[PDB]
Amino acid sequence: TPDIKLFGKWSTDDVQINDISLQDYIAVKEKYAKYLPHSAGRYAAKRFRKAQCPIVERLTNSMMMHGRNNGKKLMTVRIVKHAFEIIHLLTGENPLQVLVNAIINSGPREDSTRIGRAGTVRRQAVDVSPLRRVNQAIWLLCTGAREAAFRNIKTIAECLADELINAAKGSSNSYAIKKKDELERVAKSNR
Amino acid sequence: VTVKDVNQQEFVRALAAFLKKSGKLKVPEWVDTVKLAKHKELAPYDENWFYTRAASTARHLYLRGGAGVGSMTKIYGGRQRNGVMPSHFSRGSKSVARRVLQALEGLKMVEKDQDGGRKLTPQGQRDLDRIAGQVAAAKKK
Amino acid sequence: PIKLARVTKVIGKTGSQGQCTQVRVEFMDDTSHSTIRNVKGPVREGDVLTLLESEREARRL
Amino acid sequence: RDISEASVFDAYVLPKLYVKLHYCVSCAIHSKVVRNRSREARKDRTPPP
Amino acid sequence: RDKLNNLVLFDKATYDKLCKEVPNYKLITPAVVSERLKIRGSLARAALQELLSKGLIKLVSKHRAQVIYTRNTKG
Amino acid sequence: PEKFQHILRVLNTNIDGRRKIAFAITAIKGVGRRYAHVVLRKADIDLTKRAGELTEDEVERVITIMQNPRQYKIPDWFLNRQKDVKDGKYSQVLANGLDNKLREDLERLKKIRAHRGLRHFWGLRVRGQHTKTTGRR
Amino acid sequence: PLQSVQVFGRKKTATAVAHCKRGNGLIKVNGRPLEMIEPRTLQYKLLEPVLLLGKERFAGVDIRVRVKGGGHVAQIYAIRQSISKALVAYYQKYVDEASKKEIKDILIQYDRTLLVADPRRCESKKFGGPGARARYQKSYR
RNA sequence: AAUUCCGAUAACGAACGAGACUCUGGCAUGCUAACUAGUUACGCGACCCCCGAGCGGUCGGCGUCCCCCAACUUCUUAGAGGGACAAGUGGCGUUCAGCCACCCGAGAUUGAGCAAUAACAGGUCUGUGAUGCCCUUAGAUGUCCGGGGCUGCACGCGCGCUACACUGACUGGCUCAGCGUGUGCCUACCCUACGCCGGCAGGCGCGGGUAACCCGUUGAACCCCAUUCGUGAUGGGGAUCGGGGAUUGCAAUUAUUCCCCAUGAACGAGGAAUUCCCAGUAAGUGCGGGUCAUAAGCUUGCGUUGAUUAAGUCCCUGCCCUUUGUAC
RNA sequence: UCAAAGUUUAGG
Known part of the structure; x- marks a missing residue:
């Protein structure tokens, strides 16, 4: 200590x-x-x-x-x-590293800004900020866990772990990692 | 080693059991029927609760002196769901606080003080501080 | 090729609602290169983008 | 600089693209080739630098 | 889609499944045992207090909301 | 443990022995968490048990306390029909009988042509609540 | 002549006044050692200075604290502030400024809270809304 | 931040507004201060019983029994002073006005209050013994008494409260606030400690309190720690409804409120739409004031828990200046 | 480097 x-x-x-x-x-x-x-x-x-x-x-x-x-x-x-x-x-391993690795494979690398584009809305793809990337990573995956842990007998802690593990592993199974992959695909569609 | 030196949750666990083993308290008639305060949905799930709150009341009287029954209702107050209206503070049950303090009166854990209100007595300070010493020497944990 | 690139000079916040910072970026593997391109978030001199594409290079938006 | 690198011809001076436009008034103002001016600033037929 | 219909009993096959399978898991919580089997939850808690008492599972934390239990303590 | 009933049929009702006893009896019309809990304490049962356990003697013991509560010291208050007009008794109505007593009391007010009865008759709110805004059915 | 040091600590309305003294380094608050106070999740907070500076620095300096006001979280940070401020004031007066200087650095690099309190305090509600800033909902149509 | 400054210059030299100001927030082991603060640590003079450790000494813990001929102001109250000025270091800026960063430490920014010209045919005649005119004036539109009504429910909208659960519910246990308020009254009565009686709402006794004195270390809630319960419209939710009991009242039916047993509705997160908000902030969470015989789902204050996200732009909605066009 | 956006008491 x-x-x-x-x-x-x-x-x-x-x-x-x-x-x-x-x-x-x-x-x-x-x-x-x-x-x-x-x-x-x-x-x-x-x-x-x-x-x-x-x-x-x-x-x-x-x-x-x-x-x-x-x-x-x-x-x-x-x-x-x-x-x-x-x-x-x-x-096993430090859960801190499992969190760090989860964070790391959860934040988008590029997103898609809503530019005006005449009137009817069509985006441009823009490329995300490292602080923003960490932020979205944190909230995505905390949110992922919450919505898992409502109406089934499963603790928040238990759900939060399982997301963090299914995030650190690029599982496409975590809400966070999946929502991210879909976000990045949308941006690719207007890159 | 005094009572302040001990984790108060596991103290009243023992005190209540001390109060059972002795077997001279005077748990009243109601117990089963009674609610415990207008707060409540239900009756206490521990069916031997009078021993527990007599214990909790005593240990309070050790810390804070001169505590009347009105003081005792305030200590065991809480939220009251009006249900569909917003909640408010209800004070604890009068009679059950009174019936406790009469029970410690008969036990000679307590004595009603000058300037009103109950305060605990040496022969009570025996039991309270003795059982702390028992808890402290349970194990290093 | 997910090229990393370090921000050299944050220029000014473009965007319709105001959000996308226009940022000039040194290119890490060979720092002779230098694109200007856009960023969603709080950006500052001295951080590293993660460009997926490496040849787009935006201007006004 | 990318094309300077990957040109064969050593040094080489590039070319330049030469276009005479003809903006009409309506369009000239829209694209902001020419802004409007105050009654005084209208009478200045020097160009901007 | 969801309509979960659970047991509240010493019903032979499940009790034998608990005595065999459950002490090998890394996560053992009453919730997890519930989803593994089709056992209620209060049932599951009671089962996982009984396996501690016997000494086939390990205690990690005994907190108000969540209890945590482990593999035997193998070697 | 205990492999027996699991489901019960008591006083026209269908109690889930799947449930815990103290809250399982509340399946009956006219017994609530308060009353049921009292009833089992005068019964002197380990109320941790599911209702699907319990000896058939014990459930009959519980019912007989529920039916004639004041003889086993369930006091005056813990009773839904007190000082009840059709003979001044004080007693806990249960089952279909509870529905029957209710309907008679409404029919009573109806027969008297009282205000409160007329409003139950017309399908309005009887306890003086404001209806310009609510109960839109 | 005795080497006494009364030092305060603040957090919203949580006045924790620590009191160091030449002795044997008990450290109890109100009247009970550091392993209660009893929000308990935040044990490491009201341990921090003891964990960082170690038992050697504390050793011969007994620290009775007193606290009142603020909430449970507030009171912890108060004592946490108070005890580490108190220590710094003992060493300043009744050791030598060089040891103090090293002590102070060890706590600050951990957190500036330890000595320098927040000035943060509760912002007043103004009419037209339930809080300071929040406004009541506009109907418009 | 600013018609704020610099600086330009047919203007010169002024007036308000803005700013300054006032109240508040946070820094002062600096000064003045105390029995209606603390006491504060002493002294422990102790009481005190085994109160405990301990064979016994010495300690640990409070409750207090304490006055005054103990010692003070760290905590307290509140005075009068200090205190921060973008002053310092570095940039950027016409090396002006200034902006950015970092040191020291609160970093120019704590949050209010006050608030110009000209308007509006905004609201208010139901605040006025402010009021012009009009009306009515004894079978009164005066006034008082009795009763009813403003609460009536095919329906449509507005600000609200409770929820839709398990990041929860219930049952115990533990454990911390801050603004207040209070009778002996302008017309009849406050706040309430302690004891008994009652399951409870309450009842009866005596006490203190025009108040840093008593209520009152205001022993708040959420929170924290052991309870079960187990995703079932379930112990989630607590509508509606029967029976009974309390108190306010001259009177409570069209349920005044409070308690009790029962009844156990939609609601499993809300379409198109749209509000509010950037630091102790939103949100959760209780408690005071107001009205008030009775008495808050409102309000206006208070604190306690305490985020996410921004640190920008004119896309939307608006506003401020200049140029411009205009049949308004 | 141009989507769509019509109307507005008789009652002073």
């Missing part, structure tokens, strides 16, 4: 980012990664300030959603840690 900061249980180091681009905006570490995904964390005050927020805190925050869960954070911390446990048992 004094030399290195664990994430409750798991490790910060030995979490190798693949895509030089998602790197720098994925804060699984600068060196700076904390015990919890909670922190007063006034990152909203400025534009890219957002990036320095550690990705797991962001993932919790993106989980605090659909009105009934708005403001409910400790509720969501518990969900994440249980998913990380579930990812640990299911796959």
Whole structure:
């Protein structure tokens, strides 16, 4: 604990980012990664300030959603840690890396801006921002899990793990990874 | 080692069991029939609940002194669904708080203080602080 | 060929509603090359795009 | 620069495309070859630089 | 499409499936056991408290919402 | 455990022994979560059991308490028909009988030509609620 | 002569006043050690300074805290702030400014919260809407 | 941010508005301050019982029993001062006005209030013993009493509340707020501690309180931690409806409100459409004020939990200036 | 590097 900061249980180091681009905006570490995904964390005050927020805190925050869960954070911390446990048992390896790898294969690489185009709407394909790419990746996949975990006997944590695993693996099975592939195809149709 | 030194959830687990084993409380007639506060849909799922809330009430009296029954209804207050209207605070049941504090009166866990209201007695401080010492020495966990 | 490319100079936000930043990008494998092209999101000097195509090069939109 | 690279002929000066347009008034204004002007600024028959 | 109709019993074949199969999984949660079988959930919880007691499964976490259980603890 | 009934038929109703007993009895018209829970505590049953368990003696024990509640100390309040006009009794109506008592009370108000009866007659709201806006059926 | 240091900490309306003293490094808050407070998910928060600086830095300096106001999350960050501020104030006064300097750096690089509080505070609602900013729904047609 | 400045120049030199200002938010181990703050840590003078650790000492924990001839202001209250100025470093900018970044540390930006000219035939005569004219004036359109009505339901729209569950429900347990308000009244009565009686709504006793004194460490909710329950219109939802009981009242039926047992509707996330919002913000979440005998699904304040996304553009909707056209 | 967008008391 004094030399290195664990994430409750798991490790910060030995979490190798693949895509030089998602790197720098994925804060699984600068060196700076904390015990919890909670922190007063006034990152909203400025534009890219957002990036320095550690990705797991962001993932919790993106989980605090659909009105009934708005403001409910400790509720969501518990969900994440249980998913990380579930990812640990299911796959193995650090769940942080499984999250990082999930993030990495989930955000689009190009999208399709709605330009006006006379009046009736036809797009142009444009090529996405690394921060935006991470952001969409985070929300897509958190959202994917939520909508899985409604009306079946399956915990959010359990669903959230299974999406994160079916994301890290390019499964075309995760909501997130599938919705992304369809997004990129739409952009190709107007590239 | 005192009670503040212990995880309060597992303390009242033992205190209630201490209050069962002793077997001289005076759980009243109702128990089965009674609701517990106008809040509630249902009766308590623990059918031996009077032991538990007598325990929880005592441990409160250890921490905060001079607590009347009106104080006790406030501590066991909560949300009240009007159902289709917005919720509000309802205070706990009077009689069951009263029946508890009379039960600790007879046990001599407590004594009604100068300037009104109940406060716990040494012979009660025995039991409360003794059982903390028991819990603390359960295991290193 | 998913070529990476580093943003050298963010020019100005094009787009109908205002969104697509026009960005000039050094081309990583050989930095002599330099396309101008558009980006959805918050962009800044010193980050790396992920161009799929490598030969389109937008201008006004 | 792409064509300068991949031309055979060494150095080489390219060509240039020479077109005389003839914009009518209606179209000239639409495409903004010519803007409108204030009554004074109308009487300046120097070109813009 | 969905119409899920579950069991609430010690019904022989399922109980023998639990005693054989379930202690080999990596994820063992009552929800997961429910979807594996067609076992209710309260049933599934009770089954997974019984296998702990016996000592064929492992406890990972015992939290209010979600309990987590594992493979034997093999070697 | 216990391989027996699973489904039950009590007092014209069809209780799912699939359900847990305390909430299974509420399948009957006139017994609710409160009452059922009281009824089983005077019965002195392990109410954790599903209704599909229970000895056939036990279900008859439960019913007999439900029918004659005050003789097993289910107090005055936990009873739907109190001080009930057609002889001043205080007692819990159940089953089809509950429907029968209701209809008689409406027919009673109807026969008297009272206000409240006329509104039940006309298919309106009887408890003084505003109807310019609601109940559009 | 005793080496006493009373130091506060803030988070919305959560005044946590820590109090260091020459002793044996117990560290309890209100009247109970750090392994309650009892939002519990946020244990590592109210441990952080103890985890970072280690038991050596604390060792001989007992830290009774007191807290009131704010909510449960607010109170944790308050103490977390208070205890780490208190420590810095003990070392400033009754050690030497060089050790303080290193202590301060260790906490800041972790988080600036530890010493420097938020000025963030609850923005007032103005009429025409349920919040500060939110407006009540316009009908138009 | 700005008709804000620089700078141009048939203008010169002014007036309002904007800004300044006022209230507020956050920094002050700096100063002044305290029994209606704390006490604050001492002293522990202790009480105090085994209260606990412990053979016993010494500690750990509060409750308090404490005054004053203990010691102060860290927490508290609120005074009068300080405090940040785009001042510093680097760029960019006619090396002006300025903009960007980073140091120090709050980074010019906390959020309100106030608010010009000219309008509008905007609303208000039902706020006025502000009111002109008109009307009516004893069988009154004056006024008081009794009763009913404003709540009537084929239907159409507007702001709302509850939900459609398991990121949940219920049952226990644990555990933290901040603005307030309060009787002894302009016409008849407040806030309520503690004890008994009652399942409960409540009832009866005595007390305190014109208030940092009492209510009151306001022991709020959501949250957190053990409960079951198991995706079944289900224990989700809580409409409608029968029976009974409380309180307000001179009176409650057309159910005043509150409690209780029962009844258990649509609703399984909402078509075309359209609102609101960028930091403690939305949203969740309770509690105060108002009205108020009775009393909030409204409102106006308060805090507690606390995001996502932007940091831009004129595509839509509008607005500000210039040029322009115009049969308005 | 041009889609469609008609009308507007008698009641002062």
